[PDB]
Symmetry: D2
Subunit: 330 residues, 4 copies
Amino acid sequence: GSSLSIRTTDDKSLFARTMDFTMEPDSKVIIVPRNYGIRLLEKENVVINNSYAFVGMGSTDITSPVLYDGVNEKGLMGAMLYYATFATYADEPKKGTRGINPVYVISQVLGNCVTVDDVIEKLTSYTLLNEANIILGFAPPLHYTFTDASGESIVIEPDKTGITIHRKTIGVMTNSPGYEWHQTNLRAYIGVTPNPPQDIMMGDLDLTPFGQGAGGLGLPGDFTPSARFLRVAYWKKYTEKAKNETEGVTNLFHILSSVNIPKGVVLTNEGKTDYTIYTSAMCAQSKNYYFKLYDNSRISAVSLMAENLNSQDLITFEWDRKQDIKQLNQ
Amino acid sequence: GSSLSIRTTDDKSLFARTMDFTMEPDSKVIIVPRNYGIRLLEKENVVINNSYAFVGMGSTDITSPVLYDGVNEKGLMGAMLYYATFATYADEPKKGTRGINPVYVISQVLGNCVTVDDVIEKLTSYTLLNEANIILGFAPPLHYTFTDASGESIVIEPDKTGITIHRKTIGVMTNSPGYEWHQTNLRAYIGVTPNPPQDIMMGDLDLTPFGQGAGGLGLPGDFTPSARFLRVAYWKKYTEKAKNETEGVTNLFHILSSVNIPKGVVLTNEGKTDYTIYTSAMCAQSKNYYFKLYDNSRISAVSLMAENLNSQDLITFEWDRKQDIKQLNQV
Amino acid sequence: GSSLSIRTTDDKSLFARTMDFTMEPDSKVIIVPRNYGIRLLEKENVVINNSYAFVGMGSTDITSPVLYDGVNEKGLMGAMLYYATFATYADEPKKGTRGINPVYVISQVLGNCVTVDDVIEKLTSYTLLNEANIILGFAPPLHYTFTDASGESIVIEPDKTGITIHRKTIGVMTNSPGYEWHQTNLRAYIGVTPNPPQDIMMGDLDLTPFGQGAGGLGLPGDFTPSARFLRVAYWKKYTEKAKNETEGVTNLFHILSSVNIPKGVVLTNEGKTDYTIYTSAMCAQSKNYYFKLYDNSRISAVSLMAENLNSQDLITFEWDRKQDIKQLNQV
Amino acid sequence: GSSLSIRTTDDKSLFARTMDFTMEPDSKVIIVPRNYGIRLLEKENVVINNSYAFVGMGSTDITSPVLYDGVNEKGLMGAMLYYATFATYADEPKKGTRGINPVYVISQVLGNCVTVDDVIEKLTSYTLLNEANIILGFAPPLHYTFTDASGESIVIEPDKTGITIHRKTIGVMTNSPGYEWHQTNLRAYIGVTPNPPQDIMMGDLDLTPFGQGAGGLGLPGDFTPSARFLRVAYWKKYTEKAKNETEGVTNLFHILSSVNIPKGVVLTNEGKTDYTIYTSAMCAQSKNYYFKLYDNSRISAVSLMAENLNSQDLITFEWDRKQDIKQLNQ
Ligand SMILES: CC1(C)S[C@@H]2[C@H](NC(=O)COc3ccccc3)C(=O)N2[C@H]1C(=O)O
Ligand SMILES: CC1(C)S[C@@H]2[C@H](NC(=O)COc3ccccc3)C(=O)N2[C@H]1C(=O)O
Ligand SMILES: CC1(C)S[C@@H]2[C@H](NC(=O)COc3ccccc3)C(=O)N2[C@H]1C(=O)O
Ligand SMILES: CC1(C)S[C@@H]2[C@H](NC(=O)COc3ccccc3)C(=O)N2[C@H]1C(=O)O
């Protein structure tokens, strides 16, 4: 998948993520309220009490709410994205550390944390562990991005050297490899702009472009994580600033679109389709969650703030996998 | 912009296109009814009479309705797209031809034609002229694609040598250069697949890809016309066979999304921002014309087989330039 | 392979080409003298008589000398290169044409022609036939480039529609597809420059390139014909104006080096290894033909304006397939 | 520049390097014999006594022989290549370390070291220093590759974290960025082979390639260090094994050629040409040095073994910047 944060021009931070998977059963939008318990591991019993309510896209098939992204009531936003062959986990916690499940990292940070630093500290009392949840069958190689209300982003990744933190990132993350590497890849591609190369001659012949779009030459178009990072970064940089929160979601979906993967164009070596099952955006300041799906391109939205925050069970919706065409006449 | 037709499994032809421009003049959905009247030229009063009623996206700022694409009541779909530096027009009609404004051809084909050969034969009595319009300020360099209910597809292209007809096209079209050139560019990319590269060794070091989608390696990703064509064909090829009309409209919007241009990422020589104004799709069997827009990713649909098809007046629907977000709880 | 002509500042035209093949049959430098005799066809005994003597690389395994490229005593340079899937030949000559073996045209142009229009006009009396030879086993799909002492350049291309002449070419040619197609592909790469991209900021992070040569971003690097053409033209464009013949021969070999294929990096459908057998350059004003080879990066030169130009017999020079390393001290 | 080692099939290791610069005055091939002194710094006086004789391309304008590449008599081969914006140097040595000049690293390792491990050890009694030699005007951002007779390669690079060593590399190095990054870039490009993609159809149309060469699609062609690494790596991998030492030099020059830079096609922001001024190859087993230049494509060779190794002054040659065309007739 691919993610990014942007900064509205009326002091408002937004974060969006594409989920790319090989077939998505289930997954609703869950507001999880205060004082629900979120477990830490699955085969053992500790379950931290969340100070904060948050909301996002997740599962509900194991025993604590699993969230892939979300905003909590204090303006911190987050995602776990795949991260194949670079994710490393422990068997048992370290010294003065106790253990956590990759799939649980988000719920737990979003229920407890507010600043982006709060997340770096929280995550040195954690060692990630090699536990296979039943909804997949194994521990998804993951890495996490996060973004507080101020718009400062961070990437946390579980390498084999140990947990790697990157402060003050450019607010973009996709998938493997490490964020360090994508950030230096960016340089190879600085020539990719919105501006036309200027006309040339080859002897007597005059050479001018086929039409508009040529400043972009070099930018790869495949759906490889390295390219996906490249396009999301590069169209974040040049895309026009969003003046308001609605415009933010719109941009965020226009940029993600360049990396949105149709059914069938990417196969695995087993032979299943890898496609964009949904794509969402969240706002720090209003604590809104907006989302879109493969089978429907109408953004649905929940407001976390206008709900019973305090509050016996989780609140649920519930995917409309059907194209919501407005008929202007019958 | 960029286009293509696909065919579903319930025997249904569908054609979609994005429109890329530096600013929107007022456009709308326009239903043109039988016997309305469409000029050939802006400076002349000859007004040929449309046999058929149709529906598409168009302008209304000039004497007759101008359609960028759409579908008449006999299930013929088409569009005009930009075709810069290649498009050539006349000063006067060749002997035994009526002259025509290039912005008027879709209207005129869509009001009087049913099959693809109908359009081929129709443009023998025609000569594209160098006529301006008050909408843009000049005769825009265009070429045309068309797609009848059977699924066949063509490209009419006004070149320096004359009007060039390409028959049994793959049903994808972009902008310049000419259809044969793009059709031969496809060759240089046949190793763009949905499949993964095999693993290799470089000495004792093992190499396997970053995650996925490496079979696509070499597909360009910019928004030049020539890149768009590639994306649009290769992703047309591999995307899943659509099964119904609606899931057909989705596939089209997904395939087109790969070539949807956000504001600011493409600038002009005068630094105008070139972006996808709207995307539309239409169907031959239902005669339904769908569309989203830059600020509204919600699809609106218009049925044409439900209207006063012999109406005296145009039937039009204004743009909803407002992002139409559903509230799942009170927001 | 890949070719091009350049012009120096002491008013000298030079043409170089690489030859890419899956194995070398015996080839050599061949000086063909005036009045030698060159067949049109292998199965026929008509033997037209060469006005001019020339020199180039060729075979000797068939009844007449076969030249892949070279330069006659009137300073006309040329080559035949592969032209797969596009090249079309006859079964019989069109009315009022003598038939010819495609492998024989360079010989026949080089023995009887002086300027580029001479060659254009000459191939109106000609029809490429489908005639095999015992060297390769079949009529190879080819096209031809030519370059006279004035610097002008042309591409003769045997298409399905017929023989296609492109005049005032940029003087670069590769393999397929057709010259117009490559000439229009150049457009999609005009932002391949020797200049650095400007520095940018992405938020607060500063970006500047890895070292150098980033203006080249987007130039493909594979050994498809279409890539080679690009490399060869853009590096023809920017490389430094050569000042003399010899430094002219170097530039050519440098520009060609970018498209020189090492053994094993390109395989065939039957898995034959396709590699650059040799590179040659020749000059119009000196009538000197230069060449290195895969195993000998040392250039050997043959002067033609020093021989028995009316000799009864061929004059030939065997390949030195031995890397010719200088010993600066006793090695 | 760009470099690589290959392994002959008769138990013989060879290493070649392209030198890319913005104008090359001077530079001969220098055999430096045993018991010559090689300084360590330029403004201060320590000068280590070399156990071994070696030979390569270098300068002779400062006060100790500067070598860019070479082989010593014990079969170790080496190069310094540029390394812009990633090279970091100290002002003063560390603890138990004393100081060295980037330009001197090669002479000194090649005069003293035999195994590739010998080089890792030697280089933890060294801290590189910020001293501006007169032939350039400043300390060239450098990084070093090395290769012993056994064919095991290593890359040493001076990062800002400190000196970075990579063991058992793939035997390829160009320029920035770090070797770690190029090695993981390699994966993005595994699809680049010698084999044709197989034919496809688009509806009724048949699609087959323009001709031979299409397995290579994706490989970039620019002269950027990242691409240059990519081509040198990828054509090293697929190029046919060299059966003997002569064939080794030939391959090594056929592979380097793909990354050999013509005059004029690369400019700097000041506006000077950046071109390949020479390109050389060396053998572990025979201790031969072979070289080629921009203006001449005939390989000249020195044999280190057939010289006075022991031995008052340096031995010199001396560039023939003139195309050595054999005339087969006058
Ligand atoms: C005056 C313009 C800014 S608008 C007109 C025209 N159209 C567009 O920009 C619309 O999109 C394109 C789509 C494909 C190729 C070229 C352009 C074009 O080019 N134009 C510009 C130009 O020529 O500078
Ligand atoms: C089990 C799987 C079907 S899913 C897992 C992995 N990931 C995905 O499909 C998710 O999508 C990604 C897309 C790009 C980069 C990383 C991940 C992959 O490859 N996998 C497959 C595999 O080959 O085992
Ligand atoms: C001083 C210089 C002319 S040389 C220095 C640097 N390097 C080179 O020209 C050498 O060539 C390289 C080529 C590729 C990567 C790294 C180096 C560069 O850029 N430079 C120039 C600069 O811009 O200051
Ligand atoms: C029989 C062959 C291996 S040799 C013949 C022919 N030529 C080459 O491989 C020479 O190089 C080329 C140069 C440009 C385009 C195509 C080929 C070709 O293709 N051939 C091969 C084929 O068609 O498989």
